[PDB]
Amino acid sequence: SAKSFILRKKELMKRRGRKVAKDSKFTGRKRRHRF
Amino acid sequence: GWVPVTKLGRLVKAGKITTIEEIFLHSLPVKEFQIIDTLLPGLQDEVMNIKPVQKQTRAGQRTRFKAVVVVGDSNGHVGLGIKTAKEVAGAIRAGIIIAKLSVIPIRRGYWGTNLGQPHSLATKTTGKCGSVTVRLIPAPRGSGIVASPAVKKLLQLAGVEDVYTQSNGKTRTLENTLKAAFVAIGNTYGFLTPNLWAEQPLPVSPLDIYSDEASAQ
Amino acid sequence: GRMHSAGKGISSSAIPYSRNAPAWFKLSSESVIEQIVKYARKGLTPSQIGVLLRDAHGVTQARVITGNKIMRILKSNGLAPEIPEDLYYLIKKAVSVRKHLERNRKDKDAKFRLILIESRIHRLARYYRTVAVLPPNWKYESATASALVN
Amino acid sequence: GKGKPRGLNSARKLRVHRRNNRWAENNYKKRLLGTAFKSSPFGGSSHAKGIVLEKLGIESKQPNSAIRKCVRVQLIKNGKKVTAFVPNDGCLNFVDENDEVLLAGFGRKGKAKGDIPGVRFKVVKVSGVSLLALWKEKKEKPRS
Amino acid sequence: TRSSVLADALNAINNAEKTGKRQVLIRPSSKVIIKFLQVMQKHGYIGEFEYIDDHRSGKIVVQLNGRLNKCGVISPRFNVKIGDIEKWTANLLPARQFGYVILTTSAGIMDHEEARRKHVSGKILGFVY
Amino acid sequence: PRAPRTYSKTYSTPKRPYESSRLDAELKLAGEFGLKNKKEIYRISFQLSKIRRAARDLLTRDEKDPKRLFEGNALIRRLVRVGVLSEDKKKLDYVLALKVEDFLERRLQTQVYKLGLAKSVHHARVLITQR
RNA sequence: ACCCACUCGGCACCUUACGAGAAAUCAAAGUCUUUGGGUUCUGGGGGGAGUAUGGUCGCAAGGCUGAAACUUAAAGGAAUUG
RNA sequence: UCUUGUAAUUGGAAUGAGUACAAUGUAAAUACCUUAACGAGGAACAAUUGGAGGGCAAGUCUGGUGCCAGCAGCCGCGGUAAUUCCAGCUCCAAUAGCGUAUAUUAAAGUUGUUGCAGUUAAAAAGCUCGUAGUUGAACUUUGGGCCCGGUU
Numbered sequence A: 001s002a003k004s005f006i007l008r009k010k011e012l013m014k015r016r017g018r019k020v021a022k023d024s025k026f027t028g029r030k031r032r033h034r035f
Numbered sequence B: 001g002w003v004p005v006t007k008l009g010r011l012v013k014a015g016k017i018t019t020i021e022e023i024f025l026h027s028l029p030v031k032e033f034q035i036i037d038t039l040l041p042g043l044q045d046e047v048m049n050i051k052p053v054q055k056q057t058r059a060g061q062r063t064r065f066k067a068v069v070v071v072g073d074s075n076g077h078v079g080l081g082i083k084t085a086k087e088v089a090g091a092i093r094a095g096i097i098i099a100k101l102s103v104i105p106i107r108r109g110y111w112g113t114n115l116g117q118p119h120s121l122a123t124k125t126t127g128k129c130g131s132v133t134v135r136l137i138p139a140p141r142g143s144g145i146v147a148s149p150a151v152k153k154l155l156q157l158a159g160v161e162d163v164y165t166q167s168n169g170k171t172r173t174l175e176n177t178l179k180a181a182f183v184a185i186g187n188t189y190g191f192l193t194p195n196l197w198a199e200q201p202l203p204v205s206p207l208d209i210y211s212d213e214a215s216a217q
Numbered sequence C: 001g002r003m004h005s006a007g008k009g010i011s012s013s014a015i016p017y018s019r020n021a022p023a024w025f026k027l028s029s030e031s032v033i034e035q036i037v038k039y040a041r042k043g044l045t046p047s048q049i050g051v052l053l054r055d056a057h058g059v060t061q062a063r064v065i066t067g068n069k070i071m072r073i074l075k076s077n078g079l080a081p082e083i084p085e086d087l088y089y090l091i092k093k094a095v096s097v098r099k100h101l102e103r104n105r106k107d108k109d110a111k112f113r114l115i116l117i118e119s120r121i122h123r124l125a126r127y128y129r130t131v132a133v134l135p136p137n138w139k140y141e142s143a144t145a146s147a148l149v150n
Numbered sequence D: 001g002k003g004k005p006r007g008l009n010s011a012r013k014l015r016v017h018r019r020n021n022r023w024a025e026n027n028y029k030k031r032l033l034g035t036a037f038k039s040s041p042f043g044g045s046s047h048a049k050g051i052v053l054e055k056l057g058i059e060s061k062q063p064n065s066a067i068r069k070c071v072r073v074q075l076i077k078n079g080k081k082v083t084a085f086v087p088n089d090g091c092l093n094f095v096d097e098n099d100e101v102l103l104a105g106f107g108r109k110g111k112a113k114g115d116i117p118g119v120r121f122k123v124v125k126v127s128g129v130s131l132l133a134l135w136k137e138k139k140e141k142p143r144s
Numbered sequence E: 001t002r003s004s005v006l007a008d009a010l011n012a013i014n015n016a017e018k019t020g021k022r023q024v025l026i027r028p029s030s031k032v033i034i035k036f037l038q039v040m041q042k043h044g045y046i047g048e049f050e051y052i053d054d055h056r057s058g059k060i061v062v063q064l065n066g067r068l069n070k071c072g073v074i075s076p077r078f079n080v081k082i083g084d085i086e087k088w089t090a091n092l093l094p095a096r097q098f099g100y101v102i103l104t105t106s107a108g109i110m111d112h113e114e115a116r117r118k119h120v121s122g123k124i125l126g127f128v129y
Numbered sequence F: 001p002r003a004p005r006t007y008s009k010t011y012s013t014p015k016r017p018y019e020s021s022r023l024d025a026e027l028k029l030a031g032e033f034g035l036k037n038k039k040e041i042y043r044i045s046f047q048l049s050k051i052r053r054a055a056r057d058l059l060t061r062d063e064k065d066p067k068r069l070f071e072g073n074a075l076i077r078r079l080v081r082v083g084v085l086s087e088d089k090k091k092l093d094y095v096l097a098l099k100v101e102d103f104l105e106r107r108l109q110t111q112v113y114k115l116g117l118a119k120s121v122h123h124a125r126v127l128i129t130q131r
Numbered sequence G: 001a002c003c004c005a006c007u008c009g010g011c012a013c014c015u016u017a018c019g020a021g022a023a024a025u026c027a028a029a030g031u032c033u034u035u036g037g038g039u040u041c042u043g044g045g046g047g048g049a050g051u052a053u054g055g056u057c058g059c060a061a062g063g064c065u066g067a068a069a070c071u072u073a074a075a076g077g078a079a080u081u082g
Numbered sequence H: 001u002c003u004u005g006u007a008a009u010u011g012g013a014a015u016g017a018g019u020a021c022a023a024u025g026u027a028a029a030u031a032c033c034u035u036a037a038c039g040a041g042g043a044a045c046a047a048u049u050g051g052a053g054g055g056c057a058a059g060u061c062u063g064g065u066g067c068c069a070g071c072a073g074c075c076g077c078g079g080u081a082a083u084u085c086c087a088g089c090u091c092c093a094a095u096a097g098c099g100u101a102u103a104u105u106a107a108a109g110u111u112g113u114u115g116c117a118g119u120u121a122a123a124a125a126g127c128u129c130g131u132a133g134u135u136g137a138a139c140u141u142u143g144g145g146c147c148c149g150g151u152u
Helices: A002-010 B007-013 B034-039 B088-101 B149-158 B174-190 C031-042 C046-056 C070-076 C085-103 C108-130 C144-149 D011-023 D027-032 E005-019 E031-043 E082-092 E112-118 F020-033 F039-059 F066-082 F100-105 F108-114 F121-129
Strands: B044-056 B061-072 B077-085 B103-105 B125-128 B132-138 B167-169 D048-056 D070-075 D081-085 D101-105 D121-125 E023-026 E048-052 E059-063 E071-073 E100-105 E108-111 E122-128
Touching: B007 B034, B044 B088, B044 B149, B044 B174, B061 B088, B061 B149, B061 B174, B077 B088, B077 B149, B077 B174, B088 B103, B103 B174, B125 B174, B132 B174, B149 B174, B167 B174, C031 C046, C031 C070, C046 C070, C085 C108, C085 C144, D011 D027, D048 D081, D070 D101, D070 D121, D081 D101, E005 E023, E005 E031, E005 E059, E005 E071, E005 E122, E031 E048, E031 E059, E031 E100, E031 E108, E031 E122, E082 E100, E082 E112, E100 E112, E108 E112, F020 F039, F020 F100, F039 F066, F039 F100, F100 F108, F108 F121
Parallel strands: D081 D121
Antiparallel strands: B044 B061, B061 B077, B077 B103, B125 B132, B132 B167, D048 D070, D048 D101, D070 D081, D101 D121, E023 E059, E048 E059, E071 E122, E100 E108, E100 E122
């Protein structure tokens, strides 16, 4: 539920008036692979 | 195409007043925004916050937009503008209007000896708004402003050069810190020093002597 | 406020701004002294001599007319008592309330007031033996206090 | 006011009151009771070494799962048994039984990090070589 | 009780200046209160003060004039070494120029600038600015 | 048991490492002077902070103090002899007003470029390194 | 006995913010980032836990003093809106 | 008409990493300093370590694998509590260094002397007496005049 959590908290800074990077197909993935 | 609508508007329309120190000297109440635009140019603006707030009714959910903006030209004159309106352009516009209505002058000074074009604040000063205390401490030459980027932007728009900025409380709320900084810089203008101990002439409020072309039509 | 209660009352006496000879007195400077000695030989305490002088003979206060305080005058002629006046009255009060307690053993308020009165007696006796008015130890106890008071 | 004694000759009460209150810390009580040298899985050590006792098929969920497994290991110096999250997938074929792995913490100064409940160690090394080099096909695991 | 009469005097002055009164009554009076107010009056922070003399301990009536931000006591009277005097200022003054912290030395009761000029030190007493 | 050889590091990394204004100013300086990394900027900032701390606690000292006079005159003489501080600014509030690129101007690389002979800053660095 | 005026010491009450506070609200919860009148007691995220053990008081019931191992990213309060 | 960039375009310059006559060096050697001769055209003499919703600087990238009683029908689309299941591209930071673990310090006013808090968020002994300890009203030579000489 990482993608759902990031999308849910992703909308709050729009309500609170802060800039948010626009979403695409890189959100809920391991950006940097582990060891 | 602004027309004079009040006594101060008729005062500034003929150009018989040339400084804002007369307004800030005898505690002149400011009524409109056009006086400071027609009297001082170069008032640069920068939006600080735009947020969607809500009001819940019986049937609908009316969403307002709240605009928080700052105003200051380049030197010692800071205004804060808070507004809730219906559209983003209207909220920004009315926030700039109330920002011009809330302009306060600032007395800067020297951290050390009295040489070379004052840079910093004269006194240790504080301000508070809702469990956020913003403190301002004079700093030496070349120290710069060490503060949060919102407070740093506000103080750079102020025209002050070196400020040490300690803060306390839950500082993550942007509005509380901004209002604390605003009341702090108002406090450091309002502070009384021995340099203000010389006997001023105490003028006779020249609105009395200029009332015969500043009255009603 | 008070030392052993919750009160905060301020009722007292206000000595006037004068230290010399009220104009209506014009009587003497040693007749008042011999009245003090006569009253003390009758069997009175310094405060009672003071109240009798101020209510009967027009002596505003003996500190200004005689030049000395009443207990100093009684010390000069050898009329000083064994134990001082306020300690004597505290001891007499303690003896009376202790007799009332031993007659009525279930009175807890009288027990509490005994504890308060003995605490006051101990603090006063410590003050008196600090400046060496009492004998240097004097060891106040409950029973012999009866034989100490009368 | 302000509760505390303030007189000039009153340093002793300040000292003793501060010592008792400092005994109501969390770090001070953990340090002066010697808690890590007697009770911690490590001996107050930064890393440790252990013998792989078991590996369990711990997935995040059921068959549509995330392959994030952990092994159960027994220490060399203490003898206590702990569990450790191995690195990224593909390293499970490297870690067999009885491999003499070297372990570190997980990142919360002595507490579990991540969505794995109750795992605070990671297998830094296996058989005395690495996991980063062994996963990147740079060095290979020595036999026995 | 009145452990410090100077503290009560400074509190009375501070509250009366905050409220906006012209006169403030101070009771009881003392040598150190008179000297503290004399340092204030010499520096011009307060106006003119006059000592009502009843036989007990006196009262003081202070004519204020505004121009006083805060006066305060420091309790207990810490011993102040001379090389640490400036440190004290940095803890209780807005700037380094205006405002004075007041010391009692064996050369008298004086502000910190006079203590630095005379090369003396002593016990901290309070501050005014 | 040989007597120890004292060493000391001559740079200090910034407390907040990811902020855009400082990063772009550092890249501005590195581009205009031709620097290998950020450690030169850190080194200049470190020694300038040392100079500024010395100037500050001399200016806190009372005037006509012999230590203040001696150390202040030595500091001003040294920073004029280096060539960073100008000839007409021999005061202490003026040495508090120094900046990083004022120090970075007086390098041999920048001075060999500005005196002709190099036609670039990177050509100046390459020309210096090659003896 | 009552009425009017003043004063001392009480139990309280209505409004307000020069002030304070997260807010409800407070003549104290004020005189505090402009931080110091004097002095006792207490707290330091939540569970484990008022638990184990020791000491001590009590005829008993129980009282007083009182942990750690482990575990968790919450827990809590004040108001608005339905 | 003077200033920058791009490129399967092109030209000559320069130097040390190294290979080393020699000489310095050294108790004797190794190395540093100096130097006869050789030593650069890119897969040469090729820099790595971390990371990219926000923290925090940097993606409205690409491909493959696995599931769906969801549409289509063998082309495929969409979803996938696959906490991305696996790789690549692009970008950012530091740079001969960079990452991780543990401890400690700062941010920390979460130890508070400076400098915390205790109605309701943790926390005022049920109440009073009371020993040590901590603290404790005001007052005792102030004022005036004389000279001389020190520092700006």
